[PDB]
């Protein structure tokens, strides 16, 4: 530990040209690190772009609006149904999440501009998908470079059709990762959607109205969270973005408390609703029994004796269930070591659920986290564990070779590398087409999934009996 890890870091860095070496050195730390800087060229970052942050994660999930990937065909096609932000709807009729609406830029649009094309496709969207409740235009790289003004088109056509049309300047060259796309996306909700019902007073509020902020319902994750808060007597008026509707977001100014799960993507709009509407916000964690209990009790303390009593009833009901899960799976995973690399929340947030099954996270890191995320990580990780920010493919392979974790949890571009190396791998973005992993019902699925993969018979067979 400590000394060995710093030896590992300097050894791995010795392959870089010095500019790369001096930068990367600042982004690898033993639990001290800088974050949210640009990626060094040619080093195979795992990062995505601002469009992924805006279209892929904040806006894409809003189910009754249509989201136009404006620009060429690639980005909307590669992002089509790649993220499992679940929803209830009749797709193509009143819900549209898994579809790919695009302006498919050809060269005439790069030359003349795509603004007249946007206006004519907004009309085509209205005739062909009448039940849509709003449109957003997600800008891909060419839109800003080319000098288009999607704002003008959105205001003019919005007015003409009495429709919410949100311009989103999330062109992939902005920022340094998916992170600025969250910020651009939060500011687009603020400026074009969130204030629509400010002078409207017909929503009958109750003292227990809440909204889940920053849960994109991967595999139903927000549904497994919502049921617990409402069993505790709260009313969730909104779900921000996973299975979200536009009226839920417009109704969010009316709630009593904003419950932030993903701090990185949604802290901007939460800060705004506290300033303008006086609504308080609090961060929580529904990964694994320990954290869910901690969170249910902290949320309940913000209300009164009845919500606090129902909180204990909920904890008591689920207690036999999560205890049966740890009794079955913890003896099977006790003392196993995990290395993680994910985006901007889950690197620190799933650690408590890993510990509930007796596992130890020996290394974690984020693609696009900022320093306040790493401050929060500090606490959750043990001393002498490895931290890496915007890890390169090379560094991640080298760190794995030296540390030899029993399980690696990261994304699809990392999966097949480590499986060929014989390390059990679980996808901690898409949940490997399994889940939910939130709440108590998700803990049960998390636990059997870590077990099925870490203890799978296929791992014992990687070397031929002759070599």
């Amino acid at each position: 530990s400590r000394e060995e890890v710093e030896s590992l870091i300097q050894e791995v860095l010795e392959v870089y040209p010095e500019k790369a070496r001096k930068d990367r050195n600042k982004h690898l730390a033993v639990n001290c690190i800088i974050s949210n800087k640009k990626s060094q060229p040619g080093l195979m970052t795992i990062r995505g772009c601002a469009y992924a942050g805006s279209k892929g994660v904040v806006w894409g999930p809003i189910k009754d609006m249509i989201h136009i990937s404006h620009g060429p065909v690639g980005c909307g096609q590669y992002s089509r149904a790649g993220r499992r932000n679940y929803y209830i709807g009749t797709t193509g009729v009143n819900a549209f999440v898994t579809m790919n609406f695009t302006s498919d830029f050809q060269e005439k649009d790069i030359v003349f501009g795509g603004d007249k094309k946007l206006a004519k496709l907004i009309d085509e969207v209205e005739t062909l998908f009448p039940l849509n409740k709003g449109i957003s235009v997600q800008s891909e790289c060419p839109i800003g470079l080319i000098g288009d003004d999607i704002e003008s088109v959105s205001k003019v056509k919005g007015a003409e059709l009495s429709k919410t049309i949100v311009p989103v300047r999330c062109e992939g060259f902005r920022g340094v990762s998916q992170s600025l796309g969250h910020h651009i996306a939060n500011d687009a909700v603020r400026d074009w959607v969130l204030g629509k019902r400010d002078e409207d007073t017909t929503f009958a509020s109750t003292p227990y109205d809440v909204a889940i902020i920053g849960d994109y319902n991967i595999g139903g994750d927000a549904w497994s969270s919502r049921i617990l808060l409402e069993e505790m007597g709260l009313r969730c008026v909104a779900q921000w973005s996973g299975d979200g509707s536009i009226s839920e977001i417009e109704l969010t100014p009316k709630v009593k408390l904003n419950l932030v799960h993903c701090y990185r993507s949604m802290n901007y709009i939460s800060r705004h609703m506290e300033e303008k509407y006086g609504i308080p916000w609090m961060e929580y964690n529904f990964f694994g029994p320990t954290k869910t209990i901690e969170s249910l009790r902290a949320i309940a303390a913000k209300f009164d004796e009845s919500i606090q009593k129902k909180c204990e009833e909920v904890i008591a009901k689920y207690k036999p269930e999560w205890e049966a899960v740890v009794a079955k799976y913890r003896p099977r995973l006790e003392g196993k070591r995990v290395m993680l690399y994910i985006g901007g929340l889950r690197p620190r947030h799933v650690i408590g659920a890993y510990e509930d099954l007796g596992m130890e996270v020996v290394g974690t890191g984020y693609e696009f986290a900022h320093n306040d995320d790493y401050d929060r990580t500090m606490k959750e990780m043990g001393d002498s564990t490895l931290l890496y920010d915007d890890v390169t493919g090379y560094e991640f392979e080298e760190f794995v070779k030296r540390i030899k974790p029993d399980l690696i949890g990261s994304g699809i571009k990392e999966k097949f590398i480590f499986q060929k190396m014989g390390i059990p791998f679980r996808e901690m973005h898409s949940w490997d087409y399994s889940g939910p992993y939130h709440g108590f019902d998700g803990f049960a699925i998390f636990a059997r999934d870590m077990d099925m993969t870490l203890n799978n018979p296929c791992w014992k067979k990687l070397q031929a009996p002759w070599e």
Binding site: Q77, Y78, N100, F101, L118, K420
Partner: protein
């Protein structure tokens, strides 16, 4: 709740009563959802001919495309060369996506870098990114060649790739003799296949253009094979296999079948196999060059004919019975090798399968889509089976291609009810499978959503999907299949007849209702 002995994943957990009630309350309290009756009304309207007319009048909006963009193809072309790194000069989000798109289809590592051009490079150009990019990639991942393409950012700001690579070498960032072929691959022109072509022609110019006086056409006695954008490992393998059965010397130029199928044996291999730089430099000396997918290899044909002086044979993609025959006969002619008894047997075994399976295939109607060359090969083979390719859609197809296929359709009684659509997409095709319902769709995984929509109108209207194409993401390992040669023809026929028979059994499984026709023997 969960029973610990029977853990439920999202399906079927959210069908539990408490969840069902919670979702109903969410909807009713806060979603301001349209009434179900209006939803049904609009769904039935989207299945009609009126809706279809409106849908076909679209000029600006594309919905559910059936193509990707240029640098995706360039990356696949680059992956086919020995120890090379695909490098896309532009912005990084693109590379993340390209990599995931192929990881999902091959269920394999897809290595590719970006040089991360940001905001300020839009004002000042991406030169420094190319310099440090190349240098860092070279030292960190140790490729023997870096193959450069471009994202639309770098295209719109007009970065001169050529000057940038030359200046990287000039400043000493990469060795002067280090292979750095390039190609401008604009995501706003053509599609992924154009990117494959542009990248291949760029690598071909790099190892050959300024060396031509040394070359004699025919001296190495080999035939060059250019695969095109290919995503079935079995297609690369069957071409090499038949050419080796013939005793024909060849060079498959861009060969990714090793990097896209490494053994899981305790170590990750970043590079494996591929066409060598030596094969690329020696490629002018071949007898001739055969392009397996000619309709998206136009730039490459112009270069191999113009510079290498090879008389590229006018051959269709080697799909189905006739075009595999014509391919074999042309290869025999060019190389003087006789077509061996093995391939003559294999041909007859395919013809034998066609005679055993023809009564179930006859007159079956299909809607299908995919890339230009794949689509016409499938159309051809369908006609050879006596099936009717009723809706033929190729989003990235062109006018001349459409003419070729319409002529192929006109030379057959089975092409009489068929229309070719170019520039049209899967929302356009969704309408066609409702208004002129086929028996099956042959397509990629996006087609699963069209099948979902047809079943919602009714089981009698469901059009089943047969997955053949790219990308297939919801089934495992079908990328190992073959669609070319007699081998691939045999696989397509088996999948088609059995899809028909599985649907017949599903329809006749009803006890005392339809099972009078549930035959043990078919």
């Amino acid at each position: 709740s969960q029973q610990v002995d029977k853990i439920k994943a999202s399906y079927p957990l959210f069908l539990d009563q408490d969840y069902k009630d919670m979702l109903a309350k969410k909807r009713d309290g806060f979603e301001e959802k349209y009434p179900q009756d209006k939803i049904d009304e609009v769904f039935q309207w989207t299945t009609t001919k009126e809706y279809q007319e409106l849908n076909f009048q679209r000029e600006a909006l594309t919905v559910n495309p059936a193509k990707a963009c240029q640098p995706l193809g360039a990356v696949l072309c680059a992956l086919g060369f020995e120890k090379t790194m695909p490098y896309v000069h532009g912005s990084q989000g693109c590379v993340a996506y390209f990599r995931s798109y192929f990881n999902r289809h091959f269920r394999e590592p897809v290595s590719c870098v970006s040089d991360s051009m940001t905001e300020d490079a839009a004002v000042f150009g991406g030169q420094q990114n190319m310099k440090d990019g190349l240098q860092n990639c070279k030292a960190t991942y140790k490729p023997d060649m870096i193959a450069v393409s471009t994202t639309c950012m770098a295209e719109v700001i007009g970065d001169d790739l050529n000057a940038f690579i030359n200046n990287s070498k000039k400043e000493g960032f990469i060795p002067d003799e280090f292979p750095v072929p390039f190609a401008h691959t604009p995501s706003f022109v053509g599609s992924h296949v154009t990117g494959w072509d542009n990248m291949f022609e760029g690598i071909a110019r790099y190892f050959t253009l300024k060396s031509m006086d040394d070359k004699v056409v025919g001296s190495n006695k080999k035939i060059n094979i250019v695969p095109g954008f290919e995503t079935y490992l079995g297609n690369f393998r069957v071409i090499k296999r038949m050419l080796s059965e013939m005793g024909v010397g060849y060079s498959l130029l861009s060969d990714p079948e090793e990097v896209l199928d490494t053994p899981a044996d305790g170590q990750f291999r970043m590079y494996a196999g591929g066409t060598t730089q030596e094969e690329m430099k020696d490629a002018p000396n071949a007898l001739n060059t055969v392009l397996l997918q000619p309709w998206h290899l136009e730039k490459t044909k112009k270069f191999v004919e113009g510079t290498w002086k090879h008389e590229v044979p006018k051959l269709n993609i080697p799909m189905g019975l006739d075009w595999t025959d014509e391919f074999l006969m042309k290869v025999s002619e060019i190389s003087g090798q006789p077509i061996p008894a093995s391939l003559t047997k294999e041909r007859g075994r395919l013809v034998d399968m066609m005679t055993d399976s023809h009564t179930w295939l006859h007159g079956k109607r299909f809607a299908l889509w995919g890339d230009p060359d794949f689509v016409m090969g499938l159309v051809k083979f369908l006609l050879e089976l006596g099936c009717e390719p009723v809706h033929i859609l190729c989003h990235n197809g062109n006018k001349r291609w459409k003419k070729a296929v319409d002529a192929i359709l006109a030379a057959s009684p089975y092409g009489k009810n068929a229309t070719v659509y170019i520039g049209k997409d899967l929302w356009h095709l969704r309408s066609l499978v409702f208004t002129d319902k086929p028996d099956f769709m042959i397509g990629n995984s996006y087609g699963k959503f069209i099948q979902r929509d047809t079943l919602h109108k009714g089981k009698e209207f469901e059009v089943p999907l047969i997955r053949i194409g790219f990308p297939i993401f919801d089934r495992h390992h079908l990328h190992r299949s073959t669609t070319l040669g007699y081998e691939g023809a045999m696989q397509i026929l088996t999948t088609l007849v059995n899809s028909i028979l599985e649907r017949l059994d599903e329809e006749t499984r009803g006890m005392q209702a339809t099972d009078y026709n549930h035959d043990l023997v078919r």
